[PDB]
């Protein structure tokens, strides 16, 4: 028997699910056939409509106190929950019901972890985080837009293998992935240190791999593993390595608030 | 009649509800409803035009890349910026590789389980299954040994009693027509598809910085630093690495996905005679290759009343005929302003009042082109290419037809493409032609860098007063996309996205005309109204993306 | 009667010359000569004991990892250091994965072209070739389609007139006995082997920090920081990544390599009655799992005059009977001191004087065990395991035998393992058993970390006076390896490596007794003295490594 | 027709050839079947002895002025070259004969680039670099022990695709791979800057991924791309990332000369 997972998307763009399709350890096919039992996920489920809602209800019962609940996307509270309705009910109701019997609860992505893009600006829908919707519960936050999928998969594997969550910081983020500022572990720090800065894309220093601070790099105010774990497991791939500043997508008040070219505060 | 609701529709992106009235087992009327809104258009307002693309890319993570690219193209349009040709090559490689991933996932992960019965696959003979493909495909992973391994994974899953994503599927439904052996083949291909789409996104990652959600664009070009002799930048070693993944895609696409598309049509030929959504089709040209945002590798156009011979070519993303024709209505959507609006004058003022059959019933707007309902996406893009007499497209369709004819003894006529299966075929043709796009553009890049052009970015200036407008078109995996930006006093004063699933899924319009999803469902037979598989077959053929449709 | 030279012997590591006297069409006498020397033992002298491993790892890049590990074990022995158990798990995984890559490359890239004729593959029928493997393998890449693509790659290479490394090979030689179909199957497996070996080295890289030439060892344990909750260190994500590669090795090893080994025997059974190199065999136990450098997963021992029943087990790397038996002579080697030397008192003083049949003819020393010539390597290690009654080894050998039975109607007895083919078979058995080693040690590591043990390193102290002697044993891919370190006043005062290819390749010894290579060749039929394929067949069976043999 | 390559090993350990078996772009099989025609390489050649030396002589004549010559290992000159004899002649003679007709000449590895480990300590065999053996030729140096194989393959590719070598530094090393000190592009530079140092393997700072300077890291005095391109294309794999200091194997006078724990000079 494999450990059960219930995945509910709220105001999600599906990028957080799609991250799993890039994963290699495990691949999504090994995740769903070998690592877990994915009891509800609307993107991949054979069943639809009444049949899929029946699957969820049956799972919530059969695996009460045993399943990991995962949520992507923000949860909209304005106007009594009507900005996300599934099977004729606000999503906040579906999430609260599923949370009741969960062994562990994960906010995958910046939207569920802290509101993310969907809660930015004027916040049209009163979008909030998963933790805000579940005040009595400990929500494990896995931010990024989307995070590297293994930030999530190794969090789940820690629960499965060692029987408890990984160590968390004071935002309930796993320290193995979010324990350090990107700028406090970035390969371009020597250039920062020497005042060696790209000033525009395509300029001489940009074409030598210099620091992107003066292009708006948010590495100095963003916690994450983008410079070490990076993305896609091919080697050498993250935004800064490709030539673009970090935008701060992991980090509340940075990504989606500050302009790309707005300078970060350096500690 | 009987009234049914399908909520949630699964194996799509996002939140969709479909209602149908059924008369004597046949759908008589349908409603499509997007049930989630974020207000992304309002979120991006009042910011620097340069910032929009990072924020609006988050409209959708399935069609990641597409809103990023359309947004920069919109800003560039407003600002009158000509993008460096190296930046075009790079954008083009990203969009073609992304779309390859997207289409493969749609055929296998999202759609195959409408047509494939996994419990029937358990009764298959793996040797017989393999023999069925002799002379039909040259794919290297169709052996009885592969198929036996796959069958045992299925058997093991069923025996665990934990079916998960496979639980309560439509196994043994009267609309499932494939023999056991073909069901098994399809499951094997579903798993193999996952490897190919991962390679496609390794292409995307190496130029984008990651995927989902690329991070290498700019208003004015790209952020990739081209320097064949540079450490830590886009050098020849990195380019070789990208090429190594480009080369891994073609065999699966041509020998598996293309073949399975022809085979599905062979076993389900009735689906060539239903699911017609519209009589007018639009696509935009794509993959610009000159220094002036033009010279597209794929052509665009407008087809009216299904007449390919009189279609109107569109060869420029600045085409005034295209631009002036587009409007959206909210008469039957949950917004306040109902009269058709040109998107530079659009509003998105929410006005939710619950479901009403005859009133407002969706967060999707209703787009029209010169007042007509129009279907967009791979059926439209294929039909336009055929209308243009694009030989590459005609030859690729003919390859599918050849397999279909070998199996059935029948040919396929263009009239039969205005259908659920025609839509699926257009998608497959697209994915196949996109492999040549990738080769062409990788070679173009290498050649151009070799002439001494390493330029990638033109720094913009943004006037601090004045009001100006731009639009960025893109032919996305689900069809024509456009982002419409108005800049006033240096900041975004309006932003409107008109997205391909908006065209196709939008509700009844200002003249109460029915959009493509709703029209396509009229006539659908429904054997069991509690399990309306036939409805989901048709809807899935449009590849719904409701985060896109609604934003 | 005539004298031939084979120089260079190719498809080995390093620089080897083989001379043979042929009389009545059969080899009557042979000389093996290592023709390159570096003086690695002298280069490492006078340094800090802690530094040796990084220098002497460069004795060989084919058997990378092995000299690094033997060197740390030697220092640890001299210093009386007990290695942390986590460091043993990590060392073990590296060694096992490395060896997997090593053996696969040996069977395919180094040895297959002695037995396989690529010209003949062009005449094969791919469907017949696939049909031959039904009920024989469950490998998923033996389809006619796979074989056709491979055949086309050969066709195109031959078509280009640029055969490169396949040029002037032994095509049509009378000793080539495979049918066209089997030649084609072997070329396809040759190519597939390269994917599998790549995966094995991804395991090595993730713990070693790169390969070739790992960089995670230390005298006192390893440099991997274990912290499941740590960013940038060996955490649970990195461990999952390692496991994803360990999991990819088994199918190829079990369904292709193991099977091909049984098949080459079936077609070449005469090579079970030739190529006996010795009557004595030595291996050391390997893969320690306790806190005190013991509790080995694989057993070791000494077999005298081919008698398994009365063999002597070796269970400890501190076994004085093993230590005291080992000596090397340079009577027929290009060094000055000729009498047999215990390695702690060894010298390596070059004394080149050209080739003489009865004098000095090699940079390889001549090792003995209590004055006898001994074969080391996979044949030794399998015979010792059979002697020990190791069920896993019995069972794996039996699987190979059963395939051979099925194909020929004959069985294989232990007497037939003392041969060119038995040597090949022991190597394959080892590679197969190593996959269980990998699973066992990964699981042990995960379990131990879970108990709260993250210890990986104990910092050594090295007394500044005193003289201390240490020896590091390791069962390498080619056999028992030993590094011998003497420390005096804090620095290395003597360093001697006695390497497995030294035992096997070494020239006539102090008593002019013939080493295993030279012995194995007596009796070899040679159909064409100008193209002595049969000689190279036997010599390749030992997997020569001459940078190892000579250092 | 594919461009011809002649590979000759001198006092090599085979690690430089073995790097190719880890390559992915191109893989070794695609290298030899599609990118180049490998006319001579003793590790993979079907032919042996007389037949392989005939392959070489024919190729040197047939492809005169067109082939790329590659050498791994040092070249030993002491006692008239007898420390490496192939087909009864000193390797130095084989190398000089092959160099006469070469279109380009590449020293792959530290041994051929500058003598490397084989020339270290007392230099028992009078081992020297490829360039020392060919004073009148421009030798392209790809150091490392062994280098990442793409440092070599993309150099060869630049020669084939654009018709000339890549841009080289004053040691004739390609700037894309060797143009910067590892320490001037090392992701642990922030820890160096803050005085956050591992003191011994397994200690608390080591287990947090701090800088390895005080363990003897030679990144401050070693040119290379180990911290960016890294190794094996799996993502995150180079010696420092795994927990061990750089030893300076790329760089003459550092690797094989200085102790592992001996501290580097910092610029
Ligand atoms: S965190 Fe980002 S990728 Fe995930 S749902 Fe939100 S917008 Fe999408
Ligand atoms: S500002 Fe950005 S690019 Fe520069 S050192 Fe900091 S994180 Fe790296
Ligand atoms: S450079 Fe290193 S890997 Fe290459 S031959 Fe020399 S010792 Fe071996
Ligand atoms: S001393 Fe080494 S680990 Fe520390 S920053 Fe420099 S190169 Fe990196
Ligand atoms: N493709 C796609 Fe998404 C939709 N509809 C966009 O644009
Ligand atoms: N295996 C190996 Fe190398 C040899 N001989 C060593 O030790
Ligand atoms: S924008 Fe996001 S993905 Fe990493 S590099 Fe910055 S936190
Ligand atoms: S030892 Fe060598 S491999 Fe790189 S990290 Fe240092 S130059
Ligand atoms: Mg809109
Ligand atoms: Mg020795
Ligand atoms: Ni979308
Ligand atoms: Ni070796």
Considering Cα of C537, then C542, then C547, then C550, what sign does the dihedral take?
negative
CA dihedral of residues B514, B516, B521, B522 (deg, nearest 10) = 40
Three-state secondary-structure class, residue B545:
strand
Three-state secondary-structure class, residue D206:
helix
Residues 8-27, chain B, touching A (beta carbon < 8 A)? 8-15
Contact (CB<8Å) B143/C138: no
Nearest to D39 by CA among D50, D55, D27: D55
Q: Distance of alpha carbon B352 from its chain centroid, rounded?
A: 28
Q: How far is B190 from chain D (nearest CA, A)?
A: 25
Asked whether B234 and B206 are in contact (CB, 8 A), the reply is no
Asked whether A33 and B187 are in contact (CB, 8 A), the reply is no
Cα B549 to ligand 11 centre (Å): 8
Separation of alpha carbons A91 and A114, rounded Å: 17
Q: Could you tell me whether strands C26-34 and B2-6 are parallel, antiparallel, or unpaired per DSSP bridges?
A: unpaired
Q: How far is C25 from chain D (nearest CA, A)?
A: 19
**Hey, what are C453's tokens?**
């043990």
Separation of alpha carbons B545 and D179, rounded Å: 47
Residue with the smallest CA separation from ligand 8 atom 5 is: D246
Separation of alpha carbons C27 and C526, rounded Å: 7
Q: Which ligand is nearest to the CA of C501?
A: 6
Q: Which string of DSSP letters, residue by residue, matches D3-36?
A: PEEEEEESB--SHHHHHGGG--TT-HHHIIIII-
HSE of B471, CA atoms in CB hemisphere, 13 A:
22
| Angle, vertex CA C361, rays to CA C355 and CA C367, nearest 5 | 170
The reply to whether C130 touches chain B by the CB within 8 Å rule is: yes
Pocket of ligand 5 (CB under 6 A): B 60, 63, 66, 476-478, 481, 499-501, 545, 548
Nearest-by-Cβ selection for C140 from B138, B139, B149: B149
Nearest to C62 by CA among C102, C18, C21: C102
Q: Which string of DSSP letters, residue by residue, matches D164-181?
A: SPPPB-TTS-BHHHHSSB
- D164, with CB counted inside 10 A (0-12, 13-18, 19+), is exposed
Asked whether A143 and A110 are in contact (CB, 8 A), the reply is yes
Asked whether B240 and D154 are in contact (CB, 8 A), the reply is yes
Asked whether A71 and A193 are in contact (CB, 8 A), the reply is no
Separation of alpha carbons C536 and D48, rounded Å: 9
Q: How far is A85 from chain D (nearest CA, A)?
A: 41
Asked whether A121 and B32 are in contact (CB, 8 A), the reply is no
**Hey, what are D219's tokens?**
């990144």
Domain A1-177: CATH architecture, name and number where available: 3-Layer(aba) Sandwich (3.40)
The size of chain B, in residues, is 551
The reply to whether C231 touches chain A by the CB within 8 Å rule is: yes
Contact (CB<8Å) B50/A33: no
**Hey, what are D239's tokens?**
């010696």
CATH number of C1-551: 1.10.645.10
Three-state secondary-structure class, residue C475:
strand
Determine whether the annotation assigns residue B196 to a binding site. no
Nearest to D127 by CA among A105, C38, A81, C385: C38
Q: Which ligand is nearest to the CA of B497?
A: 9
Asked whether A216 and A261 are in contact (CB, 8 A), the reply is yes
Residue C165 φ/ψ, nearest 5 degrees: -75, -10
Q: How far is B238 from chain C (nearest CA, A)?
A: 19
C-D contacts at Cβ under 8 angstroms: 284
Separation of alpha carbons D178 and C265, rounded Å: 49
Q: Which ligand is nearest to the CA of C56?
A: 3
Query: For chain C, first and last CA: distance in Å?
Result: 35
Query: For chain A, first and last CA: distance in Å?
Result: 48
Measure Cα distances from B259 to A203, B139, C65, C196 in Å: 47, 10, 47, 29
Asked whether C247 and C254 are in contact (CB, 8 A), the reply is no
The size of chain C, in residues, is 551
Determine whether the annotation assigns residue B431 to a binding site. no
- B27, with CB counted inside 10 A (0-12, 13-18, 19+), is buried
Residues of chain A contacting D, Cβ within 8 Å: 180, 183-191, 193-194, 209, 227-230, 232-237, 241
- D48, with CB counted inside 10 A (0-12, 13-18, 19+), is buried
Which atom, in ligand 2's list, is nearest to the CA of A217? Answer: 2
Domain ranges of chain C: 1-551
Separation of alpha carbons C349 and C244, rounded Å: 48
Separation of alpha carbons B150 and B140, rounded Å: 15
Separation of alpha carbons C259 and C253, rounded Å: 9
**Hey, what are B169's tokens?**
């599927």
Instruction: Count Cβ atoms below 10 Å from residue C352 Cβ, excluding itself.
Output: 17
Separation of alpha carbons B522 and B21, rounded Å: 9
Instruction: Count Cβ atoms below 10 Å from residue A43 Cβ, excluding itself.
Output: 22
Nearest to C222 by CA among C41, C418, C416, C457: C457
Task: Write out chain D residues lying below 8 Å of A188, CB-based.
Answer: 185
Q: Which helix (H) or strand (E) holds B282?
A: strand B281-283
**Hey, what are D70's tokens?**
């590659």
A-C contacts at Cβ under 8 angstroms: 61
D166 Cβ contact partners less than 8 Å away, ≥ 6 residues apart: B228, B229, B236, D154, D155, D158, D174, D175, D176
Asked whether D221 and D181 are in contact (CB, 8 A), the reply is yes
Separation of alpha carbons A195 and A186, rounded Å: 15
Q: How far is it between the farthest Cα atoms of chain B?
A: 72
Residue of B168, B220, B533, B535 best to disrupt the A interface, most CBs of A under 10 A: B168
Fold topology of A178-267: Cytochrome-c3 Hydrogenase; Chain A, domain 2 (4.10.480)
Separation of alpha carbons B346 and B42, rounded Å: 11
Instruction: Count Cβ atoms below 10 Å from residue A238 Cβ, excluding itself.
Output: 26
Contact (CB<8Å) D154/B231: no
Testing ligand 5's pocket by substitution, the residue of B479, B549, B551 carrying the most ligand atoms inside 8 A of its CB is B479
User: Does ligand 8 come within 6 angstroms of the Cβ of D181?
Assistant: no
D62 Cβ contact partners less than 8 Å away, ≥ 6 residues apart: none
Three-state secondary-structure class, residue B362:
strand
Residue with the smallest CA separation from ligand 3 atom 5 is: D12
Contact (CB<8Å) A121/B62: no
DSSP B271: G
Q: Which string of DSSP letters, residue by residue, matches B114-155?
A: GT--HHHHTT--HHHHHHHTTTT---TT--HHHHHHHHHHHH
CA dihedral of residues C212, C218, C221, C226 (deg, nearest 10) = -70
A78 Cβ contact partners less than 8 Å away, ≥ 6 residues apart: A124, A125, A126
User: Does ligand 1 come within 6 angstroms of the Cβ of A73?
Assistant: yes
Testing ligand 2's pocket by substitution, the residue of A187, A193, A208, A217 carrying the most ligand atoms inside 8 A of its CB is A217
Asked whether C38 and C525 are in contact (CB, 8 A), the reply is no
Asked whether C183 and C117 are in contact (CB, 8 A), the reply is yes
Q: Could you tell me whether strands D4-9 and D37-40 are parallel, antiparallel, or unpaired per DSSP bridges?
A: parallel
Asked whether B429 and B382 are in contact (CB, 8 A), the reply is yes
Q: What own/partner pairs with CB < 8 Å and gap ≥ 24 does B130-138 have?
A: B130/C143, B132/B181, B132/B182, B132/B185, B133/B185, B133/B259, B136/B259, B136/B263, B136/B403, B136/B406, B136/B407, B137/B255, B137/B256, B137/B259, B137/C145, B138/B255, B138/C145, B138/C148, B138/C149
Q: Where do breaks (C to N over 2.5 Å) occur in chain B, by preceding residue number?
A: none
Asked whether C455 and C84 are in contact (CB, 8 A), the reply is yes
**Secondary structure string (H, E, C) spanning C300-316:** EEEECCCCHHHCEEECC
Nearest-by-Cβ selection for A167 from C229, C237, C240: C229
Asked whether B476 and B461 are in contact (CB, 8 A), the reply is no
Nearest to A21 by CA among B193, B206, B501: B193
User: Does ligand 2 come within 6 angstroms of the Cβ of A90?
Assistant: no
Number of H helices, E strands in chain A: 10, 9
Among all residues of chain B, which has the CA nearest to that of C141?
A: B141
Asked whether C57 and C71 are in contact (CB, 8 A), the reply is yes
Nearest to D39 by CA among D21, D63, D22, D74: D63
The reply to whether C149 touches chain B by the CB within 8 Å rule is: yes
Buried b (16+ CB within 10 A) or exposed e, C11-34: bbbbbbbbbbbbeeeebeebbbbb
Q: Which ligand is nearest to the CA of D249?
A: 8
Asked whether B524 and B274 are in contact (CB, 8 A), the reply is yes
Please name the residue ranges forming H helices in chain A. Answer: 15-18, 28-30, 49-62, 91-100, 109-114, 130-133, 149-162, 175-178, 189-194, 239-242
Instruction: Count Cβ atoms below 10 Å from residue A262 Cβ, excluding itself.
Output: 13
Asked whether C414 and C393 are in contact (CB, 8 A), the reply is no
**Secondary structure string (H, E, C) spanning D235-249:** CCCCHHHHCCCCCCC
Residue with the smallest CA separation from ligand 1 atom 6 is: A111
Testing ligand 8's pocket by substitution, the residue of D22, D152, D180, D249 carrying the most ligand atoms inside 8 A of its CB is D249
Q: What own/partner pairs with CB < 8 Å and gap ≥ 24 does C355-360 have?
A: C355/C33, C357/C19, C357/C31, C359/C332, C360/C330, C360/C331, C360/C332, C360/C333, C360/C334, C360/C507
B375 Cβ contact partners less than 8 Å away, ≥ 6 residues apart: B277, B278, B280, B281, B479, B503, B504, B516
Testing ligand 7's pocket by substitution, the residue of A16, A188, A221, A224 carrying the most ligand atoms inside 8 A of its CB is A224
- CATH 4.10.480.10 segments of chain A: 178-267
Determine whether the annotation assigns residue A249 to a binding site. yes
Block residue for tokens 């007449």:
B307
HSE of A129, CA atoms in CB hemisphere, 13 A:
23
Separation of alpha carbons C451 and C291, rounded Å: 15
Nearest to A83 by CA among A10, A134, A8: A10
Query: For chain B, first and last CA: distance in Å?
Result: 34
Q: Where are the beta strands (DSSP E) in chain A?
A: 4-9, 37-40, 67-72, 75-76, 85-86, 89-90, 102-108, 127-128, 139-142
Task: Write out chain A residues lying below 8 Å of C237, CB-based.
Answer: 25, 150-151, 153-154, 176-177, 229
The reply to whether C98 touches chain D by the CB within 8 Å rule is: no
D30 Cβ contact partners less than 8 Å away, ≥ 6 residues apart: none
Instruction: Count Cβ atoms below 10 Å from residue B313 Cβ, excluding itself.
Output: 14
Separation of alpha carbons B251 and A127, rounded Å: 44
Asked whether B344 and B77 are in contact (CB, 8 A), the reply is no
B-D contacts at Cβ under 8 angstroms: 61
Separation of alpha carbons A52 and A43, rounded Å: 11
Asked whether C39 and D125 are in contact (CB, 8 A), the reply is yes
- C512, with CB counted inside 10 A (0-12, 13-18, 19+), is exposed
Beta bridge partners, D7, equal D70
Asked whether C285 and C482 are in contact (CB, 8 A), the reply is no
């Amino acid at each position: 028997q494999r450990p059960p997972v219930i995945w509910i998307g709220a105001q999600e763009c599906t990028g957080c699910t799609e991250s799993l399709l890039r994963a290699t350890h495990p691949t999504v096919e090994n995740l769903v056939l070998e690592t877990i039992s994915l009891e509800y996920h609307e993107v991949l489920s054979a069943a639809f409509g009444h049949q899929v809602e029946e699957n969820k209800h049956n799972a919530l019962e059969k695996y009460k106190g045993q399943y990991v609940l995962v949520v992507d996307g923000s949860i909209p509270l304005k106007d009594n929950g009507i900005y996300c309705m599934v099977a004729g009910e606000p999503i906040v109701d579906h999430i609260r019901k599923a949370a009741e019997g969960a062994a562990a609860i994960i906010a995958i992505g910046s939207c569920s972890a802290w509101g993310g893009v969907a809660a930015a600006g004027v916040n049209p829908t009163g979008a909030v985080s998963l933790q805000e919707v579940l005040p009595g519960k400990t929500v494990i936050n896995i931010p990024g837009c989307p995070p590297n999928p293994h930030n999530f998969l190794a969090t789940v594997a820690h629960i499965i293998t060692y029987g408890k969550p990984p160590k968390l910081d004071d935002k309930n983020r796993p320290t193995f992935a979010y324990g350090r500022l990107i700028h406090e572990h970035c390969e371009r720090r020597p250039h920062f240190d020497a005042g060696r800065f790209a000033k525009e894309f395509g300029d001489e220093g940009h074409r030598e791999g210099w620091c992107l601070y003066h292009l708006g790099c948010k590495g100095p105010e963003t916690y994450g593993n983008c410079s070490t774990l990076q993305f896609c497991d091919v080697g050498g791939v993250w935004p800064v390595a490709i030539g673009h500043p970090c935008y701060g997508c992991n980090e509340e008040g940075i990504g989606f608030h500050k302009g790309i070219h707005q300078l970060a505060n350096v500690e | 009649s009987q009234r049914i609701t399908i909520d949630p529709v699964t194996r799509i992106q996002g939140h969709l509800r479909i209602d149908c009235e059924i008369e004597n087992g046949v759908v008589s009327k349908a409603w499509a409803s997007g049930t989630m809104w974020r207000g992304m258009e309002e979120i991006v307002k009042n910011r620097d035009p340069r910032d929009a693309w990072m924020i609006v890319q988050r409209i959708c993570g399935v069609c990641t890349t597409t809103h990023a690219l359309s947004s920069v193209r919109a800003a560039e349009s407003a600002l009158n910026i000509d993008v460096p040709v190296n930046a075009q090559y790079i954008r083009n490689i990203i969009l073609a590789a992304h779309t390859t991933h997207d289409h493969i996932v749609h055929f296998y992960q999202l759609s195959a389980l409408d047509w494939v019965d996994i419990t029937s696959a358990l009764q298959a003979d793996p040797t017989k299954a393999s023999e069925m493909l002799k002379g039909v495909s040259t794919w290297h992973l169709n052996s009885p040994e592969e198929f036996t391994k796959v069958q045992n994974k299925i058997k093991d899953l069923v025996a665990s009693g934990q079916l998960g994503i496979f639980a309560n599927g439509y196994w043994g439904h009267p609309a499932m027509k494939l023999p056991p052996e073909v069901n098994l083949i399809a499951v094997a291909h579903y798993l193999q598809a996952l490897e190919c789409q991962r390679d496609a996104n390794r292409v995307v990652a190496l130029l984008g910085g990651k995927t989902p959600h690329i991070q290498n664009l700019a208003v004015g070009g790209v952020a990739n630093p081209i320097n064949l002799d540079g450490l830590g930048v886009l050098n020849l070693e990195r380019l070789m690495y990208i090429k190594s993944f480009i080369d891994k895609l073609s065999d699966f696409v041509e020998q598996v996905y293309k073949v399975d598309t022809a085979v599905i049509a062979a076993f389900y030929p009735e689906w060539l005679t239903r699911g017609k959504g519209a009589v007018n089709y639009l696509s935009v040209p794509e993959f610009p290759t000159d220094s002036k945002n033009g010279s597209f590798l794929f052509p665009g156009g407008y087809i009216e009343n299904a007449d390919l011979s009189s279609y109107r070519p569109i060869t420029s993303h600045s085409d005034e005929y295209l631009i002036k024709g587009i409007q959206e209505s909210a008469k039957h959507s949950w917004y306040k302003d109902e009269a058709p609006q040109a998107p530079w004058e659009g509003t998105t003022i929410p006005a939710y009042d619950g479901w009403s059959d005859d009133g407002k019933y969706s967060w999707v707007k209703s787009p029209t082109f010169y007042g007509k309902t129009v279907e967009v996406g791979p059926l439209a893009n294929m039909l336009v290419k055929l209308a243009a007499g694009r030989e590459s497209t005609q030859n690729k369709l003919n390859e599918i037809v050849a397999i279909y004819q070998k199996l059935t003894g029948n040919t396929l006529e263009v009239a039969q493409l205005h259908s659920t299966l025609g839509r699926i075929i257009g998608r497959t043709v697209h994915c196949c032609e996109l492999q040549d796009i990738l080769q062409n553009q990788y070679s173009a890049l290498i050649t151009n860098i070799g002439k001494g052009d390493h330029t990638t970015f033109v720094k913009p200036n943004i006037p601090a007063t004045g009001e100006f407008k731009g639009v960025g078109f893109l032919e996305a995996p689900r069809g024509m996309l456009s982002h419409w930006m108005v800049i006033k006093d240096g900041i975004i004063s309006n932003y409107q996205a008109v997205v391909p699933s908006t065209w196709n899924s939008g509700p009844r319009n200002f003249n109460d005309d029915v959009g493509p999803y709703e029209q396509s469902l009229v006539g659908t037979p429904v054997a069991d109204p509690n399990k309306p598989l036939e409805v989901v077959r048709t809807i899935h053929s449009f590849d719904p993306c409701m985060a896109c449709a609604v934003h």
